[PDB]
Amino acid sequence: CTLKSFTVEKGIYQTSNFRVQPTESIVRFPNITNLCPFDEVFNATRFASVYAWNRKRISNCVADYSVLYNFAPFFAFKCYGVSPTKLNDLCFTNVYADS
Amino acid sequence: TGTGVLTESNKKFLPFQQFGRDIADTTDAVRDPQTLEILDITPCSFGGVSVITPGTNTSNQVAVLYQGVNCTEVPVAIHADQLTPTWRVYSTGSNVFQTRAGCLIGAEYVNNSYECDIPIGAGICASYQTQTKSHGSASSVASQSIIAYTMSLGAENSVAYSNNSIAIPTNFTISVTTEILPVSMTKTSVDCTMYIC
Amino acid sequence: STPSALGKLQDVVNHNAQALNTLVKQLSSKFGAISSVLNDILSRLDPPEAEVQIDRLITGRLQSLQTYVTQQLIRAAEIRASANLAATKMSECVLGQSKRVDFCGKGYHLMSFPQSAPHGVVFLHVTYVPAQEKNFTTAPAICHDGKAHFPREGVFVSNGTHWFVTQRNFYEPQIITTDNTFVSGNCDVVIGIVNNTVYDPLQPELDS
Amino acid sequence: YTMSLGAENSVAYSNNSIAIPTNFTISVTTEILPVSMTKTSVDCTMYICGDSTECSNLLLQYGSFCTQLKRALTGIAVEQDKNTQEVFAQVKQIYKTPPIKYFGGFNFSQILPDPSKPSKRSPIEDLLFNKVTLADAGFIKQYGDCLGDIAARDLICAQKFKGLTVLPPLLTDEMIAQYTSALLAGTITSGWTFGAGPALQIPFPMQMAYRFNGIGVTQNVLYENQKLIANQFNSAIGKIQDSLSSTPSALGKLQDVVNHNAQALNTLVKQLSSKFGAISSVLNDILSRLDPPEAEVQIDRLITGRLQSLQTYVTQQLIRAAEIRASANLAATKMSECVLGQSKRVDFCGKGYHLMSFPQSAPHGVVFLHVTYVPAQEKNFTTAPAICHDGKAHFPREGVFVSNGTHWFVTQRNFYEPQIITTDNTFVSGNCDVVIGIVNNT
Ligand SMILES: *[C@@H]1O[C@H](CO)[C@@H](O)[C@H](O)[C@H]1NC(C)=O
Ligand SMILES: *[C@@H]1O[C@H](CO)[C@@H](O)[C@H](O)[C@H]1NC(C)=O
Ligand SMILES: *[C@@H]1O[C@H](CO)[C@@H](O)[C@H](O)[C@H]1NC(C)=O
Ligand SMILES: *[C@@H]1O[C@H](CO)[C@@H](O)[C@H](O)[C@H]1NC(C)=O
Ligand SMILES: *[C@@H]1O[C@H](CO)[C@@H](O)[C@H](O)[C@H]1NC(C)=O
Ligand SMILES: *[C@@H]1O[C@H](CO)[C@@H](O)[C@H](O)[C@H]1NC(C)=O
Ligand SMILES: *[C@@H]1O[C@H](CO)[C@@H](O)[C@H](O)[C@H]1NC(C)=O
Ligand SMILES: *[C@@H]1O[C@H](CO)[C@@H](O)[C@H](O)[C@H]1NC(C)=O
């Protein structure tokens, strides 16, 4: 097929390239702990008033949305502009966990 | 990101330096990000494939050379499955020879040395040698008849040098060799508009 | 019988043909254009819109033609190197005898005959190639009367009992006289010097 | 300053002034001929496209440029093997040097193979190997890609990473070295007779007498001062070693060839980082950022840029390969006429009258040790164009008429050795009338 013939002759012919595909996936990030305050806010001694909603600065830390679950069942988890579970794959200049 | 083999590194990464780079801007060395170890990134084993064959009218058996890779650790995965021994996980037996050029699969190594017919690479030369070692059919040996061998650079003559010995040729042949010199390729004219437009 | 005897000229012809065929296939390559036919491009999109596509096709075809012309220049430089080689081979091998080693065929070139072939020349390099060599004992000089003799034209060999000066490229022994050897120095410095006898052609005329 | 064109010598021309050299030197010069650049293969998909499937699909739509480029590179590579075969494999048989390596004093030990070191290369070959920057040899290190190391000189590893593949020479460095050994053994033992067919043994003093006779120098000189020739040869070889090791400009030609190859490859690699007007220069990032429907334009532009870079690389490789092939035809000619024989073309096998030549394999080339004869210490004499005797003009058969000041001698034209003038070195043609400047003598 390479020689476009049916009577190929004696010799060595470069046909293709030998490749070895990878077989595993290794995704690793350097073990950052940097606990964002989410649980400590939600069970504080006293919250802030709704009209005077406290602007909690959520930055310089790593988010752990997996703990947003295991709260009271059928709690509203609406999200506007982005899915709640995909937030792990998104980065933000700032986050506000206004409560 | 990268594709390759992560191996343990003997090189100590600076307290703040991130990941090794070579002279030509390549992600070669590395330090484990999660924990304080160091690794090296090795390119995957990909080389090439070449087909060594005699005349098709002479044979339908074949040999396959993988250039660069080494027979010992080469990940020869399932390339193509058919009745032929090549492109499988392993060959049918001892016909897997390791040379500097690469891995020759389907051809049997020979300790004897003949003249080079099909250069494989790194001094090893192949040949479809019809032999009675299998003691089978004359025109078709039992296995694949493709063999590899060290290229006999010629008859290892020993010019009998002596401080007094000389040789004078008694006879001669008026040889008529034939040298073909291309002189004038077919002169060509390309009407630019006619071709391009 | 052997199809590779005319390998070079047939290869040149095939190179020409394959360059032409590559040029032809360039009219089939899209080069990123929406198609590879000028008429289809013109008939599908209006010139204000087809201008980009036709310019892309023109650039592709023009670059392919430029590559063709440049590789023609390169292989024409190769052809001209071989052509000055052929002119020199005609001048020194055909129009004369060349003493350049292995220039007009392996062995000592005798003469050459031009034979025109399609887009080239075939030189039947009639060369002289020795064979059936005989071994002898040699010596770099010959000591006679206490002074050295060196061969004018040949080389000293010996079948075992007699020393002969022979032509250096065809075994033809000859006796040694003053007409084939010349005196230079004496027999104290030269290594490998051997005692022998060197004949004087004038001797018989001394009878009277 | 204004360029000094040299010592403004005043050639003391006269109607009868001549200079005949009384002394000479055996100049072992050195000519370095590149023979075969490193053969290379460019996996079009792996270089231009890497591992990206969409890029390969688009490249196939573009045409058969990859096929033409691969065929051109394969032609270059088989041409490099052909260059080695034409330059080196000039003989069928392989000749082993005799164990008694005595040749009248010509110490070939630094050019003959070294049985002590395992490489068996000559010490001069070892110097040439060390001075030139090395190259990959596909060492079996179980690294997946033959040779490799951890945080070290991985530029070859990087080149194999990028898809450019340096295929090994067909004749290994040891096998190329053994072919060079065969050539040098035939030259030392057979002489010039092994290039015309069968190899015919001849001692080295006799071959050197032939070399003397082939440059218009009578061969007796080689034997009357054989020890002087041997000592000059050996000391010149030592000076060759010293100059090659000390002066870094000695191996300039081959080192520049290797550097040209390396910088061509480095420019190729940097083309991968060049943008050519694309949003970036990494195919994987382009694909992961933009889907193929919108990344198509950017990847097409990058493909065109890298294809142009590869095509320019291949064309300049063809140009420099034609240069290497011209130098390789020159090297084959120099082996045929200087090594396999004696070339009387002036300044072809080194400045001065070329005596003989020795091939020494160096990385991707050959060092010719052009042993030439160079005169020196000339003496001035009054000369004549002919010699009148008995009313007829005698002319020299082979030499030249010079005069001490009171005696006339016919001497060889390139080495002062006075000889009486007789009928054997001179012949009669005409009368003493049309010969202006004719000189009475006996
Ligand atoms: C040549 O013969 C032997 C062996 O090669 C060597 O050792 C010796 O020096 C030489 N003798 C003569 C007379 O040339
Ligand atoms: C020389 O060789 C030829 C073979 O080509 C042979 O026919 C001829 O008889 C030989 N000459 C002599 C004198 O033996
Ligand atoms: C050779 O001849 C010289 C005189 O011509 C004589 O003295 C000498 O003994 C002879 N033999 C050798 C080996 O020189
Ligand atoms: C050597 O040549 C001479 C020359 O006539 C001859 O008489 C003698 O028999 C030859 N001997 C041998 C051994 O060839
Ligand atoms: C010699 O000297 C010069 C140069 O040839 C010339 O002018 C002069 O006439 C010559 N005389 C004779 C006798 O050659
Ligand atoms: C010829 O030149 C060499 C230079 O190496 C010198 O050693 C030698 O003495 C010179 N010959 C004479 C006779 O002075
Ligand atoms: C040279 O010889 C001739 C005779 O052949 C004689 O006539 C003449 O005087 C001599 N001297 C010169 C300077 O010609
Ligand atoms: C020139 O050489 C001869 C040779 O015997 C000698 O007689 C004469 O004295 C020398 N003259 C000069 C000036 O060198």
Residue numbers in the entry:
A (entry chain B): 301 to 399
B (entry chain B): 547 to 743
C (entry chain B): 940 to 1147
D (entry chain C): 695 to 1136
Paper text:
To do this, we performed cryo-EM structure analysis of O5C2 in complex with the S protein of BQ.1. The resulting cryo-EM map revealed the asymmetric binding mode of O5C2 to the 3 RBDs of the S protein. One of the 3 RBDs exhibited a well-defined cryo-EM density corresponding to the Fab of O5C2; another RBD exhibited slightly less resolved cryo-EM density; and the final RBD showed limited and fragmented cryo-EM density that precluded further model building of the Fab. We focus-refined the cryo-EM map of the RBD in complex with the Fab of O5C2, enabling subsequent model building of the Fab. Compared with the RBM, the structural epitope of O5C2 on the RBD of BQ.1 covered an area of 1,019 Å2, which was much larger than the RBM of BQ.1 (876 Å2). Importantly, the ACE2 binding interface was completely covered within the O5C2 epitope. O5C2 corresponded to the class I neutralizing antibody against SARS-CoV-2 according to the structure-based classification. The cryo-EM structure of the S protein of BQ.1 in complex with O5C2 revealed a large RBD binding interface that was approximately 17% larger than that of the ACE2 binding interface. This exceptionally large epitope encompasses 35 residues, whereas the average epitope size of the 19 class I antibodies included in the structural comparison was 21.5 ± 6.5 residues. Although the O5C2 epitope included some variations among the Omicron variants, namely D405N (present only in BA.2 and BQ.1), F486P (present only in BQ.1), and Q493R (present only in BA.1 and BA.2), these mutations are located on the periphery of the epitope and could be tolerated by O5C2 according to the BLI competition assay. The exceptionally large RBD binding interface that minimizes the negative impacts of sequence variations among the Omicron variants may account for the broad-spectrum neutralizing activity of O5C2 against all Omicron variants tested in this study, including the most recent EG.5 variant.
The entry of the virus into host cells is facilitated by the S protein, which forms transmembrane homotrimers protruding from the viral surface. It consists of 2 functional subunits: S1 and S2. The primary function of the S1 subunit is to attach to the key receptor, angiotensin-converting enzyme 2 (ACE2), on host cells.
